[PDB]
Design a protein around this ligand. Structure first.
Ligand SMILES: CCCCCCCCCCCCCCCCCC(=O)OC[C@H](COP(=O)([O-])OCC(O)COP(=O)([O-])OC[C@@H](COC(=O)CCCCCCCCCCCCCCCCC)OC(=O)CCCCCCCCCCCCCCCCC)OC(=O)CCCCCCCCCCCCCCCCC
Ligand SMILES: CCCCCCCCCCCCCCCCCC(=O)OC[C@H](COP(=O)([O-])OCC(O)COP(=O)([O-])OC[C@@H](COC(=O)CCCCCCCCCCCCCCCCC)OC(=O)CCCCCCCCCCCCCCCCC)OC(=O)CCCCCCCCCCCCCCCCC
Ligand code: HEA
Ligand code: HEA
Ligand SMILES: CCCCCCCCCCCCCCCC(=O)O[C@H](COC(=O)CCCCCCC[C@@H](C)CCCCCCCCC)COP(=O)(O)O[C@H]1[C@H](O)[C@H](O)[C@@H](O)[C@@H](O)[C@@H]1O
Ligand SMILES: CCCCCCCCCCCCCCCCCC(=O)OC[C@H](COP(=O)(O)OCCN)OC(=O)CCCCCCCCCCCCCCCCC
Ligand SMILES: CCCCCCCCCCCCCCCC(=O)OC[C@H](C)OC(=O)CCCCCCCC[C@@H](C)CCCCCCCC
Ligand SMILES: CCCCCCCCCCCCCC(=O)O[C@H](COC(=O)CCCCCCCCCCC)COP(=O)(O)O
Ligand SMILES: CCCCCCCCCCCCC
Ligand SMILES: CCCCCCCCCCCCC
Ligand SMILES: CCCCCCCCCCCCC
Ligand SMILES: CCCCCCCCCCCCC
Ligand SMILES: CCCCCCCCCCCCC
Ligand SMILES: [Ca+2]
Ligand SMILES: [Cu+2]
Ligand SMILES: [Cu+2]
Ligand SMILES: [Cu+2]
Ligand SMILES: [Mg+2]
Lengths: 299, 184, 55, 143, 139, 66, 551
């Protein structure tokens, strides 16, 4: 069974996730085969090489087997070389970026929640085009000699702003709406510290950094398509402060026609909750719910 | 007929001390790559009319420090004291020269909170200056021990290992001086 | 008496300093007595070791 | 002639080994009972300034002349008091050096014999030795 | 002592190869160009093994074979005085207490406590250095 | 539930400790069996002496038999 | 041939036998013992922190801990285990036997050796002292990622005490590493060549080299962080590139640091396996090459902890990380080859060593799974990572640590720990460890990230968290039998009157009394191989070992 050999790995909703899961199962099979051999050898000598009651002389005092030793350094080298090749193949596919994505999402991480913006939508069939860039609010952050290349540490111009934005709340989980079967581009920028953009169904995550360009970090990753609709939870993975465990989000995948209807509702001034209700979807997140603001059960 | 245990312990520690300066060097290079074209940026104006004579004094201190080692290996405690006192004075002049450079740099707007360049410049050079001050303390402590007992081979070993630290400090500054004032 | 001054400078709760001094007023003298008594006798043993064995 | 795993070193010391999981002492008495006897021997000797010794084994045919030879193995035998016990011989031989003479051992040695004999009848070897050492040490002065 | 530096030269060659390879591999097809933090650390990691190895190379070629460097030496070959080893000292605990006082002052940013700690360290280090060199009192 | 969770956390370690202790601590140690008077003295001769005070003409002795 | 003995050895020294020694000793044997007691006190202290977290994670919702307290808990729990327990006890075992192993009377610098202990004890206390501040101790994790550690995001004094406490302790570790390199090079006994030293001595010397590379750069990075927090510097400012600058330096320190606490415990089992197998260590020459290769490779694989940052050269670090698995696999084959065709008796030191082999392998197999960036893209910053370094640290710094404690307790004390109590301790530890850490592989894969104070009932993490909580409390009660054994066997344990209580010891410490005298040796034997004590005790086997050495 693949589920037993997956050890809890989600099946995946993207082709990159499927390829990553296939690599995981094969590597686990290879690791288990090696472990069984070594565990068997350890158990064999522990059960059959114990000191008997009818032995008086010490055993043979051998401590060097050159042909065996040279053989036991080549076999592990071959296994890692095979694994390295498939490792390189998979990461190249997972990190590949198409110059023409169909949906571009601006992911803004902060302490302690999320903000999702729709930068640009360009369907490959030409049935929906939308430019959500907001450059009149990106130029309002400039702060300027400056300690760093003429800029103060409060420059914040690296962040992206959009007309349609889903802002996370302490009593409202932010829900990101994406179309199924379309290429999605995620641009990650962090306001303050480092956060983690992890969708377990994506079988992939990347750290969200402040000033990613200045840190030589590639903050853009793409998925070829999402193969099924539904709701999938997302969690922060990088230690970001007091509420690192209480800033989860949800990704809602709907049909292309549904996504077009939802964007029109958002353009019509509707909030995220009521726009989702306009396309016959739950207004709030269903995989996760907001955490109680109370600091504990003893409060 | 046997290696000097104190010399081996000092050289081994001196090698580890270099990794401490490796971290400071990494910070300077990381900030230099993010400069954007200005390194050092305004209003920082490095002047070589003072750094070069200060650097030459520290280099000359190594030669007089080596002269004290020759006297120490010769068994001449008085020759060791004369050369190490001279080395201490020039080492003190290096600290005063660096501080006088620091005062003018601060007045012109180059400070640790002022700019990223000020942070790396003062941390790299300031920590080296702390090492120079520690070396000056070693000279005083060693010279004070010369007035306590007769000049023994173990005492001559202590003089040699102190010069090892002073030579290490001088060599590190040459790397710092070339990297900061010439490789901009 | 300097608990308020210590609390501000050394980042200690003022309530904690009062109770630390309160509990320590009874526990710390007992600890010091035991340590000093053992320390004083131990120095006697150190003096002895020189006597039967030299410096 | 050395045991298995035992070697004579260049300084004359014997470097011995024992099989893993085995003991190097293996006295046929409980550990806590041995501690009580050691305390009785150590503190009894301190209170009287005379080294007290206990022997457990054979004593030839004339026990009294074997104890006498045995006491020569005790460190400072002139100021030592040895209690020899022979389970197979069912006897109690007590010998002391000349330095202990006149310090009250003459009154205490029969008492130590009587104390040891009383507990031996009950099947208590270590208890008898402990009782004999205690009464003999209490009856000897540091003079 | 030919083996001791051969250990460091072997480490030196690998560190030099890794430092060169990493710098070149980061110069090309790597975002941002040469990654300076790792390159600086690797280059000066080679320096650590180079200084220790070079010193051991110079010491080895000066002195002849030692009894512990012989493949068939006798225990009696090492007879003689080894050197000075301190029998006892309470100065080391005072040095650590002096250094810990300065660290606490630096942690809470108390300049007076930092100044006291530095003065304590100097006095404590002076005691350790002068412990076996102070002469008898003169009266 | 909540009662089962606290029962397993506090109960299993104590139950496992008792079971494993009964397996191992009830075994016979390497210590030798206490000697009995009814049995012959097959052990090697034993000479015990105190180390105090810190460092051959006899002065007398006595006899006895139980 | 009647030789007078006491009925029982003295239980304890008289009044005043220890207190003045503790603050004035230059003896490595006493200092090494002082390192085990204090490191075992810190291990107990840090374990209580994990019990608080593990109890909190048993059920959804915050029952008794807040988010801030939980964040402080795993930071300090990890700091205590990694820097206050594992790193110092490496030098704990070094001061116990390394001068004995090389036939030396003392360490190179006896006073510098004592300075390391006190620098380490007061440095650890400074960092722990953050818990008495109203704000609390450090809560940014032991990794101390930037700019989370900046004064803007971590303004409390607990983080500052954490930084300064690490600097003081790091200085002691550097000095200890300097002492160990010098001692091995200069204090070897006549006839003890470099390739005749025990594997443990080889591991410590190589480890001390790794200390001199990793710890000074950590001290440099911490001082830069202190400059940012107190002087308003811009060292780790994200606009200046300081996000990756801190990570690069910290992981250049950190990954060489985990082999500082791996290789010495590899040496410990390498000393134990030949003794209880009645056979010479398999591939003695090759194990040295494997250790050297592991040390060299560990310096240039630091960025495999930064796969998810998207700012490191993946092919370079992925390949070199795979290379480390080869020498580590070699060590298993030598250890199994040593046990192969032997006479195993499975005493407590041997029993713990076998537990190391079983435990270390599973954590090692998870390592190659993580070494590939594609697989790490899903399991990084999750409980699968938590399962890797817990299987792979526990085997080295607990199983091998306990194996060394049981192995060398008669040597350093002259008394034997009870084996029946030791077997109970081993099985309790094994069962509790596996119960509390087997299910964490599933939790991380299912989607539970690491460093979470709370989760939701609908997350599906409750059942496995409860199972892990049950196993953790078994590890807590596994602590009592060993503490009781140490407390009782230190005064009423079985006396050791022989040089080798284990029968077939090989290194030089088994050629001296238990405990060794003040200068460790009243005589030395002829050194002709890596088993001088075995040759001394069994002269008739000298011919056999030379003839049968090669298969
Ligand atoms: C902060 C400062 C704290 C205040 C100062 C300390 C208070 C008093 C200290 C003192 O006087 O000590 C000696 C003092 C005795 O003074 P002495 O008169 O010189 O010695 C008389 C003895 O007869 C002498 O007999 P002996 O010398 O033959 O003793 C043999 C054996 C006796 O062994 C035992 O009795 C059992 C030992 C305990 C069991 C260990 C638990 C298992 C851990 C694993 C160990 C693996 C190995 O003990 C040892 O040899 C242990 C020596 C190494 C201890 C290292 C201590 C760390 C020093 C750092 C601070 C200074 O100890 C006591 O009698 C104290 C009694 C109870 C103390 C409880 C301590 C609890 C606190 C936790 C400490 C852990 C660190 C965190
Ligand atoms: C810092 C670490 C530096 C020490 C590492 C070198 C290891 C060499 C092993 C050795 O020979 O041990 C000597 C000896 C070890 O004791 P032993 O086992 O009896 O050795 C007997 C030898 O066989 C017989 O040797 P001896 O009795 O002839 O004495 C040898 C000693 C004799 O050297 C002398 O003549 C005087 C040198 C004393 C060190 C001065 C400390 C400066 C602190 C300045 C603080 C303000 C800034 O030479 C050395 O230790 C060579 C090192 C050269 C001095 C470089 C230190 C500059 C510090 C830079 C600050 C940054 O310890 C010392 O005398 C020095 C170690 C003291 C370390 C202090 C720790 C606190 C540092 C924190 C400062 C931060 C302030 C804020
Ligand atoms: C290096 C050695 C080491 C050891 C031995 C351990 C021991 C244990 N640790 Fe580990 N741990 C780490 C190294 C280690 N740890 C590191 C490096 C981290 C990283 C954290 C971070 O992200 O920053 C970590 C973090 C960590 C996590 C991740 C938590 C999280 O991210 O949310 C967990 C999860 O449960 C854990 C649990 C345990 C448990 C149950 C033990 C068991 O060993 C505990 C049982 C042991 C005991 C000793 C119990 C104590 C019992 C007593 C009876 C004490 C009584 C004492 C007094 C009353 C004074 N620790
Ligand atoms: C004892 C300490 C220790 C040791 C020895 C190791 C050993 C290894 N570790 Fe690491 N590791 C840690 C301590 C340790 N580790 C810690 C503390 C962290 C997290 C720190 C933190 O975040 O706080 C970490 C995290 C960590 C990461 C980053 C995970 C992440 O955060 O995403 C990676 C990835 O490459 C890694 C891989 C490895 C590998 C490949 C080995 C190899 O050395 C193991 C190789 C061993 C074997 C392979 C078994 C023997 C081999 C054979 C029998 C032949 C088999 C051959 C094949 C299968 C090819 N570990
Ligand atoms: C001079 C040394 C003498 C020491 C000798 C030994 C005696 C020590 C006894 C131990 C004392 C501990 C008891 C203090 C118990 C107590 O009353 O305090 C609590 C806070 O716990 C604490 O601090 C406990 C930590 C104590 C630290 C341990 C002591 C060791 C120190 C003294 C060592 C110093 C180093 C050596 C000095 C160098 C000199 C050299 C010799 C709560 O106060 P509060 O602050 O109101 O918190 C509110 C909530 O309660 C409420 O829920 C809600 O959450 C809020 O209202 C919250 O504010
Ligand atoms: C020990 C710490 C030393 C104190 C460092 C310090 O505070 O220097 C920073 C300070 C800049 O102050 P600023 O706010 O720019 O105002 C200056 C107006 N004349 O003034 C400076 O910029 C002076 C910096 C001097 C360099 C000292 C190097 C210290 C190295 C270890 C840290
Ligand atoms: C015997 C004194 C012991 C000191 C007290 C510590 C003994 C500590 C052991 C029991 C208490 C811990 C169990 C429960 C903790 C909890 O869940 O919340 C309680 C409280 C709400 O949270 C706290 O923060 C408590 C204090 C944290 C620990 C201070 C660390 C001390 C630093 C060292 C310098 C001590 C030196 C001793 C020096 C010894 C004497 C020197 C003269
Ligand atoms: C700081 C003064 C600098 C003076 C410039 C010249 C440098 C060499 C000075 C030689 C001094 C000789 C003293 C001597 O032999 O006395 C010896 C004793 O000196 C001491 O014990 C303390 C010496 C001073 C300690 C310095 C601590 C702080 C260092 C600060 C570094 C900036 C003679 O002792 P005696 O009674 O003759 O056995
Ligand atoms: C559908 C879930 C099945 C459960 C699979 C459990 C696999 C256990 C593997 C244990 C491996 C131990 C090394
Ligand atoms: C980015 C252009 C080249 C920069 C090279 C800097 C090298 C600095 C090394 C100086 C070493 C002096 C001894
Ligand atoms: C393309 C430029 C390459 C520069 C390589 C420099 C290597 C590190 C130099 C460190 C110097 C420390 C003194
Ligand atoms: C000593 C081995 C302990 C193994 C503990 C793991 C048990 C896993 C049970 C999973 C049950 C899921 C419902
Ligand atoms: C090397 C990976 C080991 C994986 C161990 C998995 C433990 C079994 C957990 C079963 C959970 C069932 C819900
Ligand atoms: Ca909970
Ligand atoms: Cu976050
Ligand atoms: Cu987070
Ligand atoms: Cu790693
Ligand atoms: Mg991470």
């Amino acid at each position: 069974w693949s589920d037993a050999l997956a050890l809890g790995w989600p099946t995946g909703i993207t082709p990159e996730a499927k390829l990553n899961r296939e690599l995981w199962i094969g590597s686990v099979i290879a690791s288990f085969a090696v472990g069984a051999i070594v565990w068997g050898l350890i158990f064999w000598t522990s059960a059959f090489h114990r000191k008997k009651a009818t032995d008086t002389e010490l055993p043979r005092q051998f401590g060097y087997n050159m042909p065996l030793e040279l053989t036991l350094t080549v076999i592990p080298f071959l296994i890692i070389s095979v694994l390295f090749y498939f490792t390189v193949v998979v990461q190249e596919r997972m990190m590949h970026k198409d110059p023409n994505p169909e949906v571009v999402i601006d992911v803004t991480a902060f302490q302690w929640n999320w903000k999702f913006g729709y930068q640009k939508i360009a369907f490959a069939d030409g049935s929906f085009d939308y430019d959500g860039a907001d450059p009149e609010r990106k130029e309002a952050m400039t702060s300027r000699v400056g300690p760093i290349r003429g800029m103060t540490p409060e420059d914040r111009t690296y962040l992206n702003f959009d007309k349609i934005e889903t802002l996370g709340t302490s009593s409202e989980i932010p829900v990101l709406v994406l179309p199924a079967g379309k290429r999605i581009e995620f641009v990650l920028n962090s306001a303050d510290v480092i956060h983690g953009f992890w969708v377990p169904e994506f079988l992939f995550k990347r750290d969200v950094l402040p000033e990613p360009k200045a840190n030589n970090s590639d903050n853009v990753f793409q998925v070829s398509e999402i193969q099924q609709t539904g709701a999938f939870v997302g969690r922060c993975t990088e230690m970001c402060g007091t509420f690192h465990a209480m800033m989860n989000f949800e990704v809602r995948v709907v049909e292309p026609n549904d996504f077009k209807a939802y964007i029109d509702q958002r353009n019509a001034g509707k909030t995220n909750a009521e726009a989702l209700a306009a396309i016959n979807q739950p207004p709030l997140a269903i995989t996760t719910e907001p955490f109680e603001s109370r600091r504990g059960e003893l409060v | 007929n046997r290696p000097n245990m104190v010399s081996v312990g000092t050289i081994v520690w001196l090698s580890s001390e270099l990794m401490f300066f490796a971290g400071l060097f990494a910070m300077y290079f990381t900030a230099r790559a993010q400069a954007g074209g200005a390194w050092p940026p305004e209003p920082t104006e490095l002047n070589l009319a003072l750094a070069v004579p200060v650097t030459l004094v520290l280099i000359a201190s190594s030669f007089t420090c080596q002269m004290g080692v020759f006297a120490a290996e010769r068994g001449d405690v008085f020759g060791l004291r004369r050369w190490y006192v001279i080395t201490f004075l020039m080492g003190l002049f290096f600290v005063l020269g660096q501080g006088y450079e620091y005062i003018h740099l601060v007045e012109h707007g180059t400070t640790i909170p002022g700019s990223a360049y000020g942070s790396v410049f003062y941390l790299a050079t300031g920590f080296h200056g702390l090492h120079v001050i520690g070396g000056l303390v070693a000279f005083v402590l060693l010279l004070a021990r010369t007035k306590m007992s007769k000049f023994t081979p173990a005492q001559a070993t202590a003089a040699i290992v102190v010069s090892y630290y002073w030579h290490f400090v001088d060599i590190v500054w040459i790397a710092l001086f070339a990297t900061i004032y010439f490789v901009r | 008496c300097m608990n308020d001054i210590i609390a501000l400078k050394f980042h200690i709760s003022l309530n904690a300093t009062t109770w630390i001094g309160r509990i320590g007023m009874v526990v710390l003298p007992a600890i010091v007595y035991f340590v000093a008594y053992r320390w004083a006798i131990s120095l006697q043993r150190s003096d002895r070791e020189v006597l039967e064995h030299g410096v | 002639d050395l045991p298995y795993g035992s070697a004579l070193t260049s300084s004359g010391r014997i470097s011995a080994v024992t099989e893993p999981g085995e003991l190097s002492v293996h006295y046929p008495f409980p550990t806590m009972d041995l501690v009580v006897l050691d305390d009785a021997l150590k503190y009894g000797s301190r209170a009287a300034k005379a080294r007290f010794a206990v022997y457990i084994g054979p004593l030839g045919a004339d026990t009294a002349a074997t104890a006498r030879e045995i006491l020569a193995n005790v460190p400072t035998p002139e100021n030592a008091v040895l209690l020899a016990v022979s389970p197979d011989q069912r006897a109690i031989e007590v010998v002391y050096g000349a330095d202990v003479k006149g310090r009250g051992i003459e009154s205490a040695a029969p008492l130590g014999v009587s104390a040891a004999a009383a507990s031996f009848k009950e099947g208590n070897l270590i208890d008898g030795l402990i009782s004999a050492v205690r009464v003999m040490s209490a009856g000897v002065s540091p003079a | 002592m030919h083996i001791e530096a051969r250990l460091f030269e072997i480490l030196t060659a690998f560190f030099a190869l890794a430092a060169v390879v990493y710098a070149v591999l980061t110069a090309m097809f790597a975002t941002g160009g040469v990654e300076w933090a790792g390159t600086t650390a690797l280059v000066l990691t080679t320096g650590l093994t180079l200084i220790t190895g070079t010193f051991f190379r110079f010491v080895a070629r000066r002195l002849d074979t030692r009894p512990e460097d012989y493949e068939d030496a006798e225990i009696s070959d090492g007879a003689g005085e080894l050197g000075f080893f301190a029998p006892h000292s309470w100065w080391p605990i005072l040095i650590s207490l002096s250094f810990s006082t300065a660290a606490v002052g630096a942690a809470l940013w108390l300049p007076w406590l930092i100044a006291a700690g530095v003065a304590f360290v100097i006095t404590s280090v002076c005691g350790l250095v002068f412990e076996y060199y102070w002469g008898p009192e003169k009266h | 539930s909540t009662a089962l969770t606290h029962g397993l956390i506090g109960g299993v370690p104590l139950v496992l400790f008792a079971v494993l202790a009964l397996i191992f601590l009830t075994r016979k140690g390497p210590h030798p069996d206490t000697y009995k008077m009814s049995d012959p003295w097959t052990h090697a001769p034993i000479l015990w002496a105190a180390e105090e005070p810190r460092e051959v003409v006899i002065g007398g002795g006595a006899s006895g038999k139980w | 041939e009647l030789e007078a003995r006491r009925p029982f050895p003295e239980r304890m020294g008289p009044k005043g036998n220890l207190i003045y020694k503790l603050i004035t000793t230059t003896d490595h044997k006493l200092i090494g013992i002082m390192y085990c007691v204090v490191c075992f006190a810190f291990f107990l202290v840090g374990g209580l922190m994990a019990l608080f977290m593990r109890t909190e994670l048993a059920m959804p919702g915050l029952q008794f801990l807040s988010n801030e307290q939980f964040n402080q808990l795993f930071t300090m729990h990890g700091t205590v285990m990694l820097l206050f327990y594992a790193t110092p006890i490496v030098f704990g075992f070094a001061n116990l036997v390394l001068p004995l192993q090389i036939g030396a009377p003392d360490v190179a610098f006896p006073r510098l050796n004592a300075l390391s202990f006190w620098l380490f004890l007061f440095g650890a206390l400074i960092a722990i002292a953050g818990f008495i501040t109203p704000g609390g101790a450090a809560d940014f994790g032991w990794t101390a990622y930037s700019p989370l550690t900046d004064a803007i995001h971590s303004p409390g004094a607990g983080g500052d005490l954490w930084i300064m406490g690490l600097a003081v302790g790091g200085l002691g570790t550097i000095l200890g590493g300097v002492n160990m390199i010098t001692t091995v090079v200069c204090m070897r006994a006549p006839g003890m060549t470099m390739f005749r030293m025990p594997i443990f001595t080889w591991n410590i010397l190589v480890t001390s080299i790794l200390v001199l590379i990793a710890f000074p750069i950590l001290t440099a990075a911490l001082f830069g962080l202190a400059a940012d927090r107190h002087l308003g510097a811009h060292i780790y400012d994200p606009a200046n590139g300081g996000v990756l600058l801190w990570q690069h330096l910290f992981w250049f320190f950190g990954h060489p640091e985990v082999y500082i606490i791996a290789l010495p415990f590899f040496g410990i089992v390498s000393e134990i396996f030949p003794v209880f197998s009645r056979k010479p260590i398999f591939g003695y020459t090759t194990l040295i090459y494997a250790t050297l290769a592991i040390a060299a490779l560990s310096v240039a694989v630091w960025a495999h902890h930064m796969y998810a940052t998207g700012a490191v050269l993946l092919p370079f670090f992925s390949f070199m990380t795979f290379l480390i698995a080869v020498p580590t696999g070699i060590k298993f084959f030598n250890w199994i080859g040593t046990m192969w065709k032997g006479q195993l008796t499975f005493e407590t030191p041997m029993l713990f060593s076998v537990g190391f082999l079983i435990t270390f392998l599973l954590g090692g197999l998870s390592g190659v799974l993580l070494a590939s960036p594609p697989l790490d893209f899903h399991v990084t910053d999750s409980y699968f990572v938590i399962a890797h370094f817990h299987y792979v640290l526990f085997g080295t710094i607990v199983f091998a640590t306990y194996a060394g404690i049981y192995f060398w307790f008669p040597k350093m004390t002259g008394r034997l720990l009870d084996e029946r109590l030791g077997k109970l301790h081993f099985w309790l530890t094994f069962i509790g460890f596996h119960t509390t850490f087997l299910v964490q592989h599933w939790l991380g894969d299912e989607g539970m990230p690491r460093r979470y104070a709370d989760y939701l009932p609908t997350d599906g993490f409750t059942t496995l968290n409860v199972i892990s909580t049950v196993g953790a409390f078994i590890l807590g009660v596994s602590m009592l039998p060993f503490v009781w054994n140490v407390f009782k066997s230190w005064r009423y344990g079985e006396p050791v009157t022989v040089d080798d209580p284990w029968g077939y010891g090989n290194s030089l410490e088994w050629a001296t009394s238990c405990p060794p005298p003040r200068h460790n040796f009243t005589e030395l034997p002829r050194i002709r191989s890596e088993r001088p004590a075995f040759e001394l005790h069994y002269p008739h086997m000298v011919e056999r070992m030379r003839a049968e050495a090669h298969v």
